[PDB]
Amino acid sequence: AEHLLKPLPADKQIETGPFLEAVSHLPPFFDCLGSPVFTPIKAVISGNITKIKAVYDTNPAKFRTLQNILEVEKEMYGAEWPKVGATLALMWLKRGLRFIQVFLQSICDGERDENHPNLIRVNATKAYEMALKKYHGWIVQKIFQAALYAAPYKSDFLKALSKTEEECLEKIRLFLVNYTATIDVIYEMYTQMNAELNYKV
């Protein structure tokens, strides 16, 4: 029916396996209505999940938590870390996840352009600016801007998730609870561990 993220534990040590399982339900929503223009945002999530899963699967106990991934790979790659392995993949994945969070939260808070109430371009632009734009050069920005501008009508977007709109929005707010908390904890980990990088693609 739905797929909520696990509750945050008190130690804030998110388990890798259930994390990957949960967020693996997110790329299909880019398909529930999607031309190839939206593939760039989808791929920031999808391609990066695949990279992390690959590392985790080699040794699930060693990479049991996301914190484990960072500390283990810091030991493994030394001074090349954190621009390496699953650490780098998750550094980008958290930004894709953040895009989704801000985009969905914006919609749920009833944020819109009064001139275009059935568009979601202001919501998508807001999310892009606060999640991803900072790490994007001019070339990649155009690629993403093309996707953001091709966004579907709000009514079609909500319809697709619900295959009322107010009841749909209610369910998104519930999903956003543990989803938002989890992402914030991952951002905070990256800062705490000095794993965050600022280079642009």
Ligand SMILES: CCCCCC
């Ligand atoms: C594209 C994000 C949709 C998330 C479904 C709750």
